Design a protein around this ligand. Structure first.
Ligand code: NA
Lengths: 120, 115
């Protein structure tokens, strides 16, 4: 179970974990802002989702336009523990890398960030 | 880049077990530091596509990918003909990154996962 996870803040000012979503290594920007696990259309398609078969029931509206998005449920998400059926979505917006958000983070217990170091 | 603790609780039956995704299939390993290889049962072996019609001693294997919370890539092991009731996770794997200890019924694995 569980873990103290520590994440050396990347060059670009964020940092990224790798999770095995349905044992596909997806690279995730760790985002407390994000509500759940926002899958880029690439990583959607990489996870064998059919972008023409998804129900795009949600809409992120940004400065530069609408970005429809599709609710899904990740069956397995392994950072090491396997979390089952973690709520996320497939963002057809300009969502250029995938998000590891609160849908996954709420299941933790304790938290701290910055200098260059996101601890869980 | 990333550094975590898997904490494993000891079974009542006096053994620590890890489930792992070897080449995307979930095998059940009992942790045996008195084993050097990953020893797979023939049953676990064939789950992974090992052809038992090829063939006590042992058949050498190399697992492309083993996920615990880090992906461990290319792990040496063997299929146990005869003995293995359960598959063994030996040092071939545990050595593979960064530290671990049995505590008062708590194996804490510690891994390090680059970018
Ligand atoms: Na990882």
């Amino acid at each position: 179970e569980v873990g103290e996870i520590i994440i050396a803040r990347n060059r670009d000012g964020h940092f990224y974990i790798n999770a095995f979503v349905n044992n596909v290594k997806i690279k995730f920007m760790v985002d407390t802002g994000a509500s759940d696990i926002a899958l880029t259309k690439e990583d959607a398609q990489k996870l064998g989702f059919d972008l023409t078969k998804l129900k795009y029931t949600r809409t992120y509206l940004t400065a530069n336009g609408e970005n429809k998005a599709a609710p899904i449920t990740l069956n397995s998400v392994v950072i090491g523990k396997e979390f089952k059926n973690i709520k996320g979505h497939v963002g057809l917006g300009d969502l250029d890398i995938s998000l590891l958000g609160m849908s996954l983070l709420e299941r933790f217990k304790g938290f701290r960030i910055d200098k260059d170091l996101l601890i869980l």
